[PDB]
């Protein structure tokens, strides 16, 4: 009796908990509309098919009158990559993903090597808001395709380590 009533109350509470969770798993995909991944596409390649990049044009930005130079620029990149296809050399030039957050799929083939956000930044007048970084090859920034190191003098022979951990760098 009392135990049965307690069990029924617990079951009702659990169902309500799921409702809250059911409600969130319904109101999230609403804001997630921006990401589309529309339907079944047929990507017979992974180095020339698939998207390039997703731009979120910002409001209250007087810099939106440039809506054409961006498009023509991102269109001339593919034709320049075609005219600069390669100086044919055998190299894998493979890359992995630091952050696996792929765009959602509301489509009721490939979905891993494509439709995967690799980097997202939020440009400012001078700032940036990177949180995912460029993917690396063998943890060495000296041969990657995107990174580019500035020039500097570097006369600071021998680091200051912590407590008794002097390391003879050179």
């Amino acid at each position: 009796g009392v135990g049965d009533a307690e069990l029924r109350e617990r079951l009702r509470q659990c169902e309500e908990t799921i409702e809250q969770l059911r409600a969130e798993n319904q109101e999230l995909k609403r804001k997630l509309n921006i990401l589309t991944r529309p339907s079944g596409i047929l990507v017979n390649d992974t180095k020339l098919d698939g998207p390039i990049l997703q731009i979120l044009f910002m409001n209250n930005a007087i810099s939106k009158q440039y809506h054409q130079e961006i498009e023509e620029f991102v269109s001339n990149l593919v034709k320049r990559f075609e005219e600069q296809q390669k100086n044919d050399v055998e190299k894998t030039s493979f890359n992995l993903l630091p952050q696996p957050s792929s765009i959602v799929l509301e489509e009721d083939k490939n979905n891993k090597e494509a439709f995967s956000v690799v980097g997202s930044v939020l440009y400012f007048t001078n700032f940036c808001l990177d949180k995912l970084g460029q993917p690396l090859l063998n943890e060495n920034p000296q041969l990657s395709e995107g990174w580019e190191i500035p020039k500097y003098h570097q006369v600071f022979s021998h680091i200051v380590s912590l407590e008794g951990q002097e390391i003879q760098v050179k």
Binding site: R30, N33, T36, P38, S39, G40, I41, L42, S75
Partner: protein, 196 residues
Amino acid sequence: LPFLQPGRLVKVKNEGDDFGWGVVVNFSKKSNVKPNSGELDPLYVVEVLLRCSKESLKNSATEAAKPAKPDEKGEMQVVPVLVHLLSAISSVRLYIPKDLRPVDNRQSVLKSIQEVQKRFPDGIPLLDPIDDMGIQDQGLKKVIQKVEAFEHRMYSHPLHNDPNLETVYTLCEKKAQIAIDIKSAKRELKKARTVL
């Protein structure tokens, strides 16, 4: 109106024929000059690039109609259409040449609409009325509920799974049209000499 950029791949059917898929070129709120029987609502005209027939272009003054037939290769030209004729809005924007007005670049546009159809064999994703536009008007929820209900029981029907459904559909359409014809003929015959 904010969804009418050049390349939107709209569809047009003014109850007579299918023109196909075509890219939008321009649009305007041009009102009725010298309004016949007055004017109280503004109209909009969309200048959109369809695929017309050779016979339609050779005169190009009678009705601006009769798109090309599947037995002819046809030629594409920009045609003005009314706003209330767009039976489908897509979510794809083919690139448009710069300054145009020849033949070859329109042929490339034809080629482009031809590969893009070779990428969504299921069907081009058009839009979602609930979210993409941003409608917050009371009542549309009722109609979407009703459409979801009707299609739910539709597929929930066994006949749908059964084959030869199309043949029976055509038969029923034909007999319904015969019934309509007989109704109209009896309506006319009900006035052969009736208080004329």
